[model samples]
Target: QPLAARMRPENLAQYIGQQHLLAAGKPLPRAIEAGHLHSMILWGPPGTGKTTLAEVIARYANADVERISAVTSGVKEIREAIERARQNRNAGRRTILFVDEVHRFNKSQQDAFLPHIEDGTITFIGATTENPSFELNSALLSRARVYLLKSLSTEDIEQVLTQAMEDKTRGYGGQDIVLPDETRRAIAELVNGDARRALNTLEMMADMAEVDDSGKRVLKPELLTEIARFDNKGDRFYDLISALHKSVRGSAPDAALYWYARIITAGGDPLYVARRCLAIASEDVGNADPRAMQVAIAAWDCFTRVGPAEGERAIAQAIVYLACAPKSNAVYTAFKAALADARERPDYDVPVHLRNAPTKEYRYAHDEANAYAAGEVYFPPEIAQTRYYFPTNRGLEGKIGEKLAWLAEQDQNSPIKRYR
Candidate 1:
C-alpha cells in the first residue's frame, strides 16, 4: 500500500484536520458520536481527507462501507453497489455508499441514488474536489448536507509527516528515519497543504536519506520535489482568472499583474489570460477607451507570433493598460438590453424604408440636409421608438454621447417624421 493509504486515519481522533467540522459540539462530530450518519457531501480540494473522513464516519457509526469511484464506475457499478447496500439493509445493518469524485457521474447516474437515499437503504456520502452546486444536480445536492473541508495547514501537514515518522506499524518508527524540523516544514510547504502528497513525497525521498554517524537515517532538504497545484481545467484555473478579471475591472494593475503571474507561473495558459483580457476590454472597458479592444487583440496576436516568453509580457502590458484605462460598462449594458429585445421581439420586421427593397418614400440620407436622415425610422413602426446603446461620458464615449445628443435634437426639429 502507498504511504497515504496505509496512514489513513481510522477514527475522528486520528484525523489530522478540518476542526471546523470535527471540533467539539460541531454538527459532524455530534452526528458521528451519536452514530447518526446522515447523507453528506464532502467538498474540498484533492488530498483533503475526503475518503478518510468517509471511512472514519463509517467506523464511528458502525455502518458498513460500500466504495465506488465516479472516475471509473458507471451506472452498472452504481446499481451493484446499491444492491449490496440493499442486502446490508436487509441484514439490519446501515450502509454508507462512498462515491469518490462524485461530480463525474452523469444526471441519470446521480438520479439512481435519490430513491435509495429516501428509503434509508444507503447513507450516501459523496466526495468531490469541485463545487457541488455547479457539478451536482439540484435533487442530489438537496438531499446531502454539504460539508466543506479546507486544505490542511502547514502545521497540520507537519503533524501528519511527524506521525508517519513516529508510527511503527504503518510508517517509519522502527526504521530510524530522521526528518529534521526545517526539512519537514519545507516538505509541508512544497506539497501546498496536501497531506497525502506530503506523506507520499516523504516516502519517495526516505529511500535517499543519508546515514548519520549516530546510525539514524537523515532525510535531506534537497530531496523534496516540487508539486505545483494548478490544473488548467480545474477550479483554481477559473478562480485565478476571476481574480485577474475583477482586478482589471476594479482598476488595480498591481493585483491584476499578481494574479496574471500566479496563472502563468502555475502552468496556466497565457492565451487564456489574453482571451479574458479581450473580454474585459469590451465588457468592462467599453467605449471609455476604444483603443482597449485594439490593445487586447494586439496582445493576443503578439503572444501567437512570439510565443510565451515575450508573448506573456505583451499580455501583461495589455493587462496593465486595461487596468489603468477608464472603466465603463455602458456598451456592455446596452448590448445586453438590445439582445433581450431581439430575443423577445424576434418577429418584428425591419421598417420598409430600411429594407433592401426600398420603399419610394425612403429618403436618401446622402441627399438629405447634413447627409443625415434625422427622422428616419429604422425599426418596425411598432418598436420604432425603442432606444439602446447609451454611451458613457468618459473618454471617446463622451464625444459619442455629444454626437448622439445633437442627432436627437435634429430629430426633434425635423418635420419629416417617418412614423405618426
Candidate 2:
C-alpha cells in the first residue's frame, strides 16, 4: 500500500477530516457510534476521504464489506456480491456494499441494488464525485441518505502531513528528518484539502531528502511544482454552467459576466464556455441583433488563437453582448413545434409546381398569374396551412412579423382575382 493508503484511520477518532459529518452529534457519527448500518451515498470531490469513511462505517458496525467499482462492475458482478452477502448473512454477519464512482451506474443497475438493500442483505454505500440530482435517478436517490464530504481545509491537510511525517513505520518520521513549517505549509497549500495528496507528497519528498551536517534531512525546494486543483465534473461544475446559461437567457449581463469569471477562475474550460455562448446566441438572440451570433463565434476563435489568458476578455465581451442583445426565443420555440412534426409526420413530397423540373400544367411561382398562387399547400395535406414560424414582435422579428401579416393578405387573393 502507498503512504496515503497505509495511513488510513482504523476508527473515527483517528480520521483527520469531515468534521461536518463526523462531529460528535452529527447524524453520521451518531448512527455509526450507535452501531446502526444504513444505506447512504457519500458525495464529494476527489481525495476527501469518501472511501475511508465508508470503510470506517463498516468497521464501526462490524459489518463485512463487499467492494465493487462502478466503472468495472456489471449486473453479474453485482449478483456475485449479493450472493457473497447472502453467505455472510447466514453467518449472522451484516454486509456493506461499498461502490466507488457509483454515479456511473444507470437506473436499472441502481435499482438492482435496491432490492438487496430492502431485504436487509446488504447496506449500500455509494461514492460519487458528481451531482446526484443531475446524474442519479430519483429511485436510488430516494432510498439513500446523502452525506456531503467537503475538501479538507489547509489546516486539516497540514495536520495530516504532520501525522504522516511523525509515523515511523508507515511514514518518514523514523529518519529524524525535520520538515520546516514553511515547507509543510507549502505542501498543504498546494495539496488543496486532499490529505492523501498531502501524505503522498510528503512521502515523495522524504524519499529524496538529503541529510545535512546537523543530521536532519531537508526537503529540496526544486521538487515543488504548480498548485492548481480544479475538478469541473461534480455539483460545483454543473451549477456554475447552469448559472452561466440562465444569466444569458435572463438578460443579466452582470450576472453572466460574474459566472463567466467564476468558472474561469475555478479552472473551467474557456472553450467550453465560449461554445456554450455561441449556442446561446442562436437560441436566445437569433434574428434579433444577428451580430450577436457573429460576435459569439468570433469569441470562440479568439480564445483558440491567443489561448485563455489574454483571450478570455474576448469571450467575456461576447457573453455581455449576447446577454444584452434583444432577446427572442421565437426561433427556438418554433423549431420544437416543427421538430415534433419531423419526428411524427411523413416526409411529404414537394408539390408538382414547386419541383425543380416543370410539370405539364406547372407555372413558376414568381411568374404565375400575377406572381404567386393563392391557397398554396406547402405542408402535408392534413396540416398544409399550419404556420410554424411565429415571429415575435420584439427586435428585428417585429418588422418581419408585420411583413408576414401583409403577405398573408396577399395570399388570400383567389386565382380569379390573380387572372383579372
Candidate 3:
C-alpha cells in the first residue's frame, strides 16, 4: 500500500490534523467518540482527510461501511447501496454509505439518498470538493449537517511526513533512510495543504534517495521539481482576483500588483484581470478621475496590440493609476438607486414636457435663462423631486457637486414652476 493509504488514521488519537473541527468537546469528535453519528456533508479542499474521516467514523461506530464514488456511480449503485443498507439493518448492523464527491451526483441521484436517511437504514456521509449549497439538492442539504474542513498547514504536513517516516509497520522506518529537516519542509511546502500529496512525495523521495558511506539513504533536493500551488478553476482563482480588485479599490497599489502577478504566474487568464480593472475604474475611481475609464480601456487596447509581455505591464500601469486616483462611487450608487426605483414603479410615465414626442411645452435649456431650465419637472409627476445622484466633494465629483448645488439654487429662484 502507498504511504498515504497505509497512514490512514485508525482512530481519533491517531488523527494527525484538523484540531479546529476535531478538538475535544467539539461536536464532531464527541459524536464520533459516543458513536452518535449523523448524516453529514464534509466540504473541503482535496486531501484534507474527508475520506479518512468517513472510514474512522465507521470504525468508531462499529458499523458496516459501503463506499461509492459519485464520479462513476449512478442511480444503479445508489439503489444497490440502499438495498445493502436495508439488509444490514435486518441483520441489526448499522451501515454508513460513504459517498465521495457527492456534488457530482445529479438531482435524482442525490434525491435517492433522502428516503434511506430518513428511515434510518443508512448513515449518509458525503464528501465534496465544491460548495454544497451551490451543488447539492436542498432536501439532501437539510437532512445533513455541513462540516467545513480547513486545509492542512505546512507545519501540519511536516508532522504528517515525520509520522510516516517513523512508523515502521506502515512507513519507511524499516529502511536506513534519512530525511533532513529542510528537505522534509520543502516537500511539505511543495504540496501546499495536501497531506496525501506530501506523503506521496516523501515516498518518492525515499525511493530516489542516494546511499552514502554510512549506508544511509539520504533524500536530496534534486529529486524534486518546481510546483505552483494554483487552482485556476476553483475558489482559489476567484480569491486571487478578489484580492487584486480589493487591493486596487483600497488604494494599495503594491498589493494589487502582487496579486495580479500571482494570477498571471499561476496560469490564470490575464485578460480576465484586465476586464476586472475596467470595472474598478468605474466603480472605485468613478468621476474622481474621468480619464480612469479611458486609461483602463486603453490598457486593454495595448494588450491586444502588443503581446502579453508588454500588455500586462500596460494593465499594471492602469491599476496603479486607479489605486492612486481620487475615489468615489457616486455614479455606481446613483445608477443602482435609480434602477431600484424604476423596477419598483415600471409604470411611471415620462412627463409631457420631457417626452420626445411632439410637446410644444418642452423648455429647451439652451433657450432658457443661463442656459438652464430651472424647476423642470422631468421625472414622472409623482417623483418630480426624486434625487438619486449625490456627488461627493472629491476629485472631479467635487466640481460636479458644486454645479448641481448652483442648479438647485436657480430652480429655487425660478418663477416658472407648477408640478411642486
Candidate 4:
C-alpha cells in the first residue's frame, strides 16, 4: 500500500492539524460543506496534508477527483486531464483536479489551465511546497483561493502516530507493538513536523518488528536512525536547505560543507543548490569576498555545462569560498535601504556631477589623468557624503577596504576638477 493510503485522513474531522482550515465556522470548512470549493492552491512544506486535503475534499464532497504530477506530466497531460474532467462534468458530475508539486510546472504549463478554470469546467486544487507567489501564474492565482498549510506541530505529529498505532485496518492496530511516549516523541521530533515522515518512520520501525521473531515490537532511537534514510524529498529537504543557508550566512564553512554534502548525497538537484550558493555569495557575502561572487557564478556555469558528478566539485569549491570569505551585506543593504528611501521620499535627485551631461559640460570620471573625481557630490544634497557600502578589513575585503580608504583620502585632500 502507498504511504498516503496508510496515512490518509478519512475525513476532515480526523485531520490532525490545519485547524485554520477545518475549525468550526472557518471559511474553508464552510465552503466545503456548502459545495463551494473553488479553484485553489494549497501551499506549504511537505507532510502537511496538501494532497490528503485534496483527497478528502474529492471523496467527501462527491466530486470526481483527478490527480497529476507536475514533474513527470507535461502540458499535454494537463490538457488531457482537463479534457477528461470536462467530459466528467458533462456527465453530470463535478470534478476536482489536484496538481501535486504545482510549482514545478512552468508559466506556460500553468497557464494551460486558466481558461478551463475560468469557465468552471474543473476546480483546480494545486499543491506546492514552494511559495505560490513566485511559482504560480498570476492569472490562475487570481482566480483561485490560496491556503497556506503549516508543518505539523510535535503535538500534532504525536497524535498522528498514536492514531496510526491504534488504527488496525490501516495502521499497526492489531500488532502487539508497544510504542512508548518518549520513543514516539523522538520519532515525531525526528520527523521535523512532517506527518508523512512520522508515519513512514513508524511503518519502517514496525517492519523491523516483523523481522525480529522476539514478538516485542518496540522502536529504539538507534534502530529508527538506522532504518530511516531521511531522504531529503520531504521535510528533510527544506530542513537541510535551511541549515545550509544559515550555515553559510553564519560563516560556518564546516557546517555549510556538511549540509551541502548531505543534500548532494540525498539526490538534490546540484544546479538548484549552486544557484542558491550564487545568491548567497551576493546577498550575504557582497564586497566582503569579492571573489565569492565570481566563484559562485563560475560554479553555476560549470554545473550547467557539466553534469552532477563534476558539478559537485565546483559547488564544493564555491561553498568553501563563500563560507571562508569575509561576510558583508553593505552593498546588499545599501540597495535595499535606498530602495525603501526612494519609495518613502520622492524629493531626491542624482547629483549634477554624477549625471551624464553628454556635452561640453560633460566630464567623464574615467577620462581624467588622475582617474578620480575629487570633492564631487554623487548623491542629493540631503544625502551627501552618506556612505552606504562599507568594506570590511577581513579576508579579501581588506584590499577593497584599503582602496576605498585611499580614494576617500584623495577626494578629501584634492580640489582637482579631474573629471574624465
Candidate 5:
C-alpha cells in the first residue's frame, strides 16, 4: 500500500476509539470459518483493507460478484448491475453486488437495489468511509447490517510487510527489501490502516532503495509532520489552529479558550475554526470527549444557519467547551488494534449478540454512562457490548469518572440504556 496513511495500547484508561462488538477471545471468527457470512457495509478510511477484506470474503466460494463505484457510476450502472444479478440468480448463482462509496448514491439511488437485495437475488454489500446513517436511506439500511472498520494496527502492517517481501509475484521476495520493523510499524501507522497505502509507499521506497556508495542498495522511510510558515494577519489563522490543537492535546482548557478568543478577536473564520477544531477531537481529545467533534461541527453549522452574531457565539461557546473537555487518543489506538486483527482471518462471523439498532447505539464508558475504560480495542470507538462513553481523571471527566464507576454497580444508571 501507500506508506502515506497508516498501535494497540493495552489499558482501559486510554482514550476512546470506534465501536465494534467482538474481540480476540470471541466465537465469531470460528463461525465465519464455518462459512456463515452475511451482507454488511465495511465502513472506513481508504486502504484500511476494506476492499482487500471484502474481496477475500467474495472468494470464499468463488461467489459471483458485481462491482460499482458510486463515485463514477450513476443509477444507469446500478440498473445494469441489477439486471446481471437477475440473470445470475436465474442461472442458480448467488450474486454479490459490491458498491464502493455507497454513500455517494442518494436516497433514490440507494433504494434502487432494495428489491433485488430483499428478494435474495443479490446480496448487497457496500463500502464507505462516511457515517452510513446520514448518507443512506433508512428503508434500505434496515434490510442489511452495518459494520465499521478503520485504522491498520502495527501488527497488520508487519504482516503485510512480511508478505510483500516473500511474495515472488507481487513482493520483493528475497531481494534485499531493506525494510525494518520500526519502519514497517511507522509506515503502517502512517497509512491509517489502509494496507494499500503501506504497499504503495514501499514500492516508492524501493525506487529510492539503491546506490549510496559502491552502488549498494538499501532503504527505510520515516513519516514527517508540519511546520507552517506564515506571517500575515491571516497567518494568525494557522496560529489559532496550532494554539487550539496543542491546548487540547495538553489538557489546558483555559489556554485553549484564550487562543480561541484571540482568534475570534482577530477574525478567524468560524467555519474554518470549526473544521480545524474537529481535527483535535480526533487527534488530541478523541474518545476522551466523543462530543468534541460533534459540538465543533454543530457550532459551525449553527453559526452558518443562524448567521453572524448569533451563530458566531454558538461556535465560540463550543470551542471553549471542547477545549475544557477531556482528552484521549484511545479511539485512535482502538483502530490500530482492530485493523491489525482484521488483516487476519478473512472469514469472520458477527458475534451472536452483536445485533444492531438503527446503527446509533454504541456502548460506551463515557456519554451519559460514567466510564473510565473504553470498550474492546476491537471497537473503533470506546464502546463495549453495551455502548457508553467513559470519563477520565483528565478534566471534568474526574467527577464523571466517579459517576461511571457507580453506574457499573447500580442498575438504575444514566437515563439511557446501559447494556445492549
Candidate 6:
C-alpha cells in the first residue's frame, strides 16, 4: 500500500498538523463543529494531509465527498460533479466536492463551478500543491477561502510514529517495537516531516524484521536505514524542489546539481523540474542574469527532446551559468511598478505610432526621420512616460541599460515633434 494510505488519519484528532485550521476557535474547526462546511481551497505542499483533511471533513459532516483528478478531468467533469451534488441534495444529502491538483484546471473549467458554488449546490474543496494566488483563476479564488497547510514538523512526525507504535490496529500496536531515540531522529530527518513517509518507513522496517531466537521481532537502525530510501513522492517531492530552488537562488551550483541529481535518481519528472527552473530563471534570476531564462528554456527543450540523462546535464549547465552570472531585480521591480500604476490608472490609449498601422488612421514611427515624438504625450492622456521595464548595469544587461539610457535621453532632448 502507498505511504499515504497507511498513514491516513481515522479522525480529526488523529490528523497531525495544520493546527491553524483545526485548533479551537479556528474558522475551520468552528465551522465543522457547527456542521456548516463551506467551499474552500487547501493550498500546501504535497504530503501535508490535504486529501486526508478533505476526507475528514466529508466523514465528520456526513456530506457526500466527490473527488476528481484535474489531470484527466475537465469542465465536463466539473459539471457532472455539480449535477451529482444536485441529485444528492434532492435526496437530502450535503456534498463536498474535492478537486485534486485543482491548479491544473484552466479558467473555463474553474469558471464552470462558480454558478453552482454561488448557488450553494456543492461545497468546493480544492487541493493543490502550488500557490493558488498564481495558479488559480481570480474568479474562482475570490469565491473560495484558501487555507494554507504547512509541512509536518519533526515533532509531528515523531507523534505519528508514536501513534503507529501504540495503535492496536493497522500499526505495530500489538507488537513489541522499541525504536531508539537516535533511530527515531534518523527516521524523522529522512522522512522530512511527512507523516506518510515516516509511517511507510516504519512499516517497511517492521516488515524487514525477523523472529529472534527468543521469538521477538527486532527492528534495528541498520534495517530502518536500508528501507528508508527516500522516494520523491508525497512530501519529499516538495522538499527536494524547495532545496533545488533555494540552491539556485543562493547561487550554489554544486548544491543545485546535487538536488537535481537526487531528483533524477529518485525518478522525478525531469520536464517538471525543468519547467520550474524556467520560471525561477525569470522570477528569481530576472535581470540578474538575462541568460538564465534562455539557459532554462534551452534545458527544458533539451529535456523534452532528449530525455532525462541529457536533460540533467543541460539543467546542470544552466545552474552553473546562473550561479556565475551577475544578479539584479531591476527588470522585475520595474514591471511590478508599471503593473501597480496600470491598476491604479485603468484607462490608457496606445501612442498613435505604437498602435497598429494596418488600421484606417494608424501611423508608423519608422516611416519618419525622427521616430520618437519630441514630448512625452500621455498615450492614455492620463499616464505619460510610465516606465515598465528597467535594465541594470549587471551581466549582459549593461549593454541593454546603456542603449535604454541613450534612447531615454533622445526622447527627452529631441527637437521635432515627430509622431510618424
lDDT of 6 by residue, 1-420 (tens): 544465577577888878977987877887776677878898887778888888787877888888888987766876688788999989998898998998998788788788878887788889998888987888888878988989888888888888887776666666666766677778889988677778777776664465565545656778765643345367877898899888877878889889977876565767777788777777776875767888889877776664234456787787777766677667678878877887887666676656655465333456645674434443554555456777767776888889778777876776653342
lDDT per residue (tens digit) for residues 339-358 in model 5: 66567535455432344544
Tell me how candidate 2 scores on lDDT.
0.80
In TM-score terms, candidate 6 sits at: 0.50
Error of 5 at 184 (Å): 1.9
The digit string of per-residue lDDT tens for model 3 on 179-245 reads 7888888898788999989987886666445556665777776667633233438888899999999
TM-score of 2: 0.50
Query: What would the TM-scores of all predictions be?
Result: 0.51, 0.50, 0.51, 0.51, 0.44, 0.50
Q: What is the lDDT of residue 238 in candidate 3?
A: 90
lDDT of 2 by residue, 1-420 (tens): 567888887688878888977888977788888789878898899989988887888888988888899998877987798899999999999989999999998777777777788889889889999977778878888878888989889988888888877878877667676777888888988878888888877766654455556656666555556222235388988899999999999999999999988987676777889889878987888886678889998888887765234478899999888888898888888889899988888778765556688645344478765576554655545666777788777789989999878767777765433222
Alpha-carbon shift of residue 73 in model 6 (angstroms): 5.2
Clashes of each: 0, 0, 0, 2, 49, 2
Global lDDT of each candidate: 0.86, 0.80, 0.85, 0.78, 0.62, 0.75
Clashes of 3: 0
Superpose all Cα atoms of candidate 5 onto the true structure and report the RMSD in Å to 1 decimal: 28.4
**Top of the candidates by lDDT:** 1
lDDT of 5: 0.62
Comparing 3 and 6 by lDDT, which wins? 3
Which residue pairs overlap in candidate 1's backbone?
none
lDDT of 1 by residue, 1-420 (tens): 667888988877789989988998886798887888888999999978998888989998888999999998876887799899999999999999999999998888789788899999989999999888988999988889899999999989998999898889988888777888989989988888889889878876664455566656778777665333234388878899999999999999999999998987676778888889889999998988989999999999998875245678899999999999998899899999999998888687666767788644778889988999988878788887898888888788889999999999999899988886
Candidate 2 or 5, higher lDDT? 2
